[PDB]
Amino acid sequence: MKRQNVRTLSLIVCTFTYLLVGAAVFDALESDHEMREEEKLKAEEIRIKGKYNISSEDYRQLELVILQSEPHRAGVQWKFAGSFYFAITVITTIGYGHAAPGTDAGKAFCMFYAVLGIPLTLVMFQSLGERMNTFVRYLLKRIKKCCGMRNTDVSMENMVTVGFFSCMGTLCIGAAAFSQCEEWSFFHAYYYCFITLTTIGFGDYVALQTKGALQKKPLYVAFSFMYILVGLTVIGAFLNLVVLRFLTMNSEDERRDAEAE
Amino acid sequence: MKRQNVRTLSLIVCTFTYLLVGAAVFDALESDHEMREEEKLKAEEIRIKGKYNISSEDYRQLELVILQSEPHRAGVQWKFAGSFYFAITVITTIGYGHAAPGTDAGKAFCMFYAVLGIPLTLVMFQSLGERMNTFVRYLLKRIKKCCGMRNTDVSMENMVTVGFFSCMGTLCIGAAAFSQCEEWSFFHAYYYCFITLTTIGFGDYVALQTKGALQKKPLYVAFSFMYILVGLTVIGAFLNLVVLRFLTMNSEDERRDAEAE
Numbered sequence A, B: 001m002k003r004q005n006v007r008t009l010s011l012i013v014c015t016f017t018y019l020l021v022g023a024a025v026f027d028a029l030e031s032d033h034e035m036r037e038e039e040k041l042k043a044e045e046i047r048i049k050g051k052y053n054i055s056s057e058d059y060r061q062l063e064l065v066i067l068q069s070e071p072h073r074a075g076v077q078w079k080f081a082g083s084f085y086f087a088i089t090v091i092t093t094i095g096y097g098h099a100a101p102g103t104d105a106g107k108a109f110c111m112f113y114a115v116l117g118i119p120l121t122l123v124m125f126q127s128l129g130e131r132m133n134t135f136v137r138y139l140l141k142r143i144k145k146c147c148g149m150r151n152t153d154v155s156m157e158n159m160v161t162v163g164f165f166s167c168m169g170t171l172c173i174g175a176a177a178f179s180q181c182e183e184w185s186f187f188h189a190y191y192y193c194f195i196t197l198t199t200i201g202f203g204d205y206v207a208l209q210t211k212g213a214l215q216k217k218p219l220y221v222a223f224s225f226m227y228i229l230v231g232l233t234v235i236g237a238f239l240n241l242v243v244l245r246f247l248t249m250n251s252e253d254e255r256r257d258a259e260a261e
Ligand SMILES: CC(C)CCC[C@@H](C)[C@H]1CC[C@H]2[C@@H]3CC=C4C[C@@H](OC(=O)CCC(=O)O)CC[C@]4(C)[C@H]3CC[C@]12C
Pocket: A003, A006, A007, A010, A011, A014, A242, A243, A246, B115, B116, B119, B120, B123
């Protein structure tokens, strides 16, 4: 009886203590960096606003104009290439938000589109991940036969090893690809890859948004979309191997508790 | 044998055709709206840049200054309240990106923090969702006993009804709460609630970012965090009821295929 509850409460208490350990570390890592940046930006504002004697209403309007032009200076978003990039970022839940629906009709359709798109996408990547893990298990057992191993067992530790180095590999191949095209540093390209395939998607870095690359370099658009849909497949297969048993075993324990009645 | 493959391929083909149906509709809904907005913003830029004779290097620097000041004009982010809000938006994968780690040390810690935080959060919300569905099943069967129903069965259709109206309810309670505090329209507040609890998180709308509300209105900070952690629990419970069987039945079918050997 109680086992389901004690594991639920221990998960909750673990989560909230993990948030506290998070928050106090992000304060320690960069409250001072924000404090430097604010002062430096304020000085640059004051000197420019003064040198041109910009009126407060004019500066406010210019600020709004700049902030709303930021999504357009990267090149036209809402054409088929960019609408396909957006649709990917909705149904996979990346949600960069480099562009977002302007009209209320766009917002309303985006909600109805996500409602159906996301269950479909979860079931697709989890099915294709289970196929990947089955294929890897076959090829690894055959590899042990070819290597003449003393037994053909393929333990959980072997699968978890190949899964983890598949994740590390696909992130490094992403970083090496994007750093050569977007001119980000390798570390920032790796950060962008991790934040994409994890589906966090802050959207401070966004691929393709460079001198109209969404229109002038369609082979690289194709790479970016295939990289998302393949990388999420590999991460999905890794969660399918390591984590998914824990989602169901609470219900399995409840079924066992009912069968013990 | 083939059933696992034909369902995998049909899911893939369904996903890609669903992306095409998406992209061609977002083009139809708002390519023209972008085309109007670009022209209007270009005219406002030209008139202001000309009226003050702003030099191109000065305008470029001012543009960078404005874009980097946007995350600070909302109030200081990296203090405990804002670091806790950020930590929520990482481990739940909302990822608004209203703020993002400035220093490379912040980025590196954010990656190690997400790696462990997200599996923990999935297991927490799926466990707590399974608890919610069990409790709802109990209370609904007792409600049928109290109402004197001709039988005490609690079918899937009854659970799916209560789950769906729980999702619709928690979104409406969110929209009614935020529209009264952020001064968004009710539709935009509902859009923000749906985009938050779906974990897409574009970050064009973000709660708390208003005249320092992260520091002056801590009771409303508390509401925003509880609304995220409760709303995701309800959405998690709904996916646990409707979708989760489809993630596993592909492996169950493979086990059956092995047992038939
Ligand atoms: C993706 C890779 C890099 C990391 C994967 C980590 C997860 C597999 C870990 C992280 C947190 C773990 C959970 C943290 C705490 C608990 C509570 C624990 O419950 C108890 O001990 C209660 C008493 C009992 O059930 O015996 C059961 C395991 C569980 C769910 C853990 C299951 C495994 C989790 C999800």
